Design brief:
The structure is a homodimer. Chain A is mostly helical. Chain A is 76% helix and 0% strand. The first copy, chain A, has one domain: Ribonucleotide Reductase, subunit A, CATH 1.10.620. Chain A is built from 13 helices and no strands. The complex binds palmitic acid (2 copies) and fe (iii) ion (FE) (4 copies). The PDB classes it as oxidoreductase. Keywords: R2-like ligand-binding oxidase, diiron cofactor, ribonucleotide reductase R2 subunit fold, metalloprotein, oxidoreductase. The assembly is dimeric.
């Protein structure tokens, strides 16, 4: 429906708003372009590998590529809901959030193209637990906001997207990439991309913390809802992590070749740490 | 609802898609930051003016500030509709479109703040015709896409937003700013912003041409709909232009002071030219 008026005609941007400040930082720190990354060495690395070694890296890339695409599509309802609420500074920031995720989709798709696996269907490495999070729960929670923008709905959406998908899974994925391939000296272009992604992710997670905390600040009983929604998704998080771990343990040729002692118990504890850490960044009071 | 799968897992980005190419150009040409513009001379210019001269520049700024804010909010339904249709490259491009409009909102709001009119309510310079376009028709046409993404609905939305608001009014506004203030040597910061806006606008209009043409290409009877929707809005376009012209003719102190022979008949013909020119960029066949 209609606009009743416009904030930048009646007044100005709220220059001191936390999300205006986050928007300003995003513009300053968000200049990187996936089209500038040199993937030539990645191509050679991947070709050098045996078929067994080649397969090793793909489950993780499969999880990220679909994840970036899901979040690019599924952030749009949040931008709409906050826009309808007149939260202009949040919307300005969210334009940087969405543009970041677009570059993340682009970065992984360029890597796949470059190393010669674009024609390969990597959906085979999404198990039921992954599908429950990314094919179902994420888009359910975000799309709800089109018809229900209650504090309850907004907390559930920020929890699944910013605190679980980004703050638990994506963060653990970046850590895993560096623990495995940065050590091996493999895929320098991909690891350059991962570093830029991990920098962007910082702002995405901070938006989710801001959003969940400002709702909790109104009524501390929303804190219990946050914790509950975090716990509801945990079985699928660890169920996916456990599935990737088993794939990893079954095809170890890459680790042998490159002298990597991949401690899967250390990666598993990192996921658990991330999850608990995100819980602690929200204050009940 | 759920994702059935993901294009960048099954395959890759369509690298040859026109909107992927437009997205790539947006990243290359879209680096400018309103926070870097030096408005110090603008502040001094505005303070130097008499109250009568001060008032001269504000109707145009009022029209732009509200316009940028409306389009920042009202592009979100188009991104959603194309996302739901699986048009991934269009969505990637649209993240740059939305982020551009956010910077446009920011740029005018920084100028208002800097010259000392942020506290002034400029809604007084929106007449009924302006309100019909920006407070009503624009958001009606875009929001429709949430429940009706038929070719008819998508053509009406691209027509009002890209071909009328951007391709006719915004373009004519940029031309007007340069005809008046660039001549006077006034407001260098604002005119630097206008140049960056006008560069961005090129891509926005090209998205609308692409969108309307790909629908017309399917069925040439959609051409008649395009023309009809262009004509429906014309009375409000010229009605706003005529209102600004009369304000201009009533307070001429700025033009006298700075030796500007502001040909309002030339600006009016420029609007008419723009409108007819946009019609001609769509081919029936
Ligand atoms: C065995 C170690 C487990 C590591 C967990 C790997 C997680 C891979 C899936 C990542 C999903 C990516 C979500 C992207 C979110 C975003 O782009 O903001
Ligand atoms: C007297 C000369 C008439 C000139 C017409 C001035 C138009 C001013 C209003 C501009 C609306 C701005 C719309 C912004 C669109 C966008 O930012 O993409
Ligand atoms: Fe991402
Ligand atoms: Fe993210
Ligand atoms: Fe604009
Ligand atoms: Fe525009």
């Amino acid at each position: 429906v209609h606009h009743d008026g416009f904030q930048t005609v009646k007044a100005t941007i709220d220059w001191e708003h936390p999300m205006f400040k986050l928007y300003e930082k995003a513009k300053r720190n968000g200049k990187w372009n996936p089209a500038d990354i040199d993937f030539s060495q990645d191509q050679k690395d991947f070709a050098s590998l045996t078929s067994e070694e080649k397969i090793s890296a793909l489950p993780l890339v499969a999880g990220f590529s679909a994840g970036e695409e899901a979040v690019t599509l599924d952030i749009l309802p949040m931008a709409h809901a906050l826009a309808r609420q007149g939260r202009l500074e949040d919307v300005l920031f969210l334009t940087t959030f969405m543009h970041d995720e677009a570059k993340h989709v682009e970065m992984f798709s360029r890597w796949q193209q470059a190393v010669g696996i674009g024609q390969m269907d990597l959906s085979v490495f999404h198990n039921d637990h992954y599908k429950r999070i990314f094919y179902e729960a994420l888009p359910e929670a975000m799309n709800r906001l089109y018809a229900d923008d209650s504090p309850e709905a907004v907390i559930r959406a920020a929890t699944v997207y910013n605190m679980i998908v980004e703050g638990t899974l994506a963060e653990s994925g970046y850590y895993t990439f560096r623990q495995i391939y940065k050590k091996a000296g493999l895929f320098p272009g991909l690891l350059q991309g991962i570093d830029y992604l991990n920098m962007d992710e910082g702002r995405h997670i901070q938006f989710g913390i801001y959003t969940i905390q400002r709702i909790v600040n109104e009524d501390e009983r929303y804190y219990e809802l946050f914790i509950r929604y975090m716990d509801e998704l945990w079985p699928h998080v660890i169920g996916y992590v456990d599935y990737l771990t088993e794939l990893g343990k079954r095809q170890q040729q890459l680790a042998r070749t490159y002298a990597l002692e991949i401690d899967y118990d250390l990666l598993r504890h990192y996921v658990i740490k991330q999850f608990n850490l995100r819980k602690k960044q929200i204050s009940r009071t």
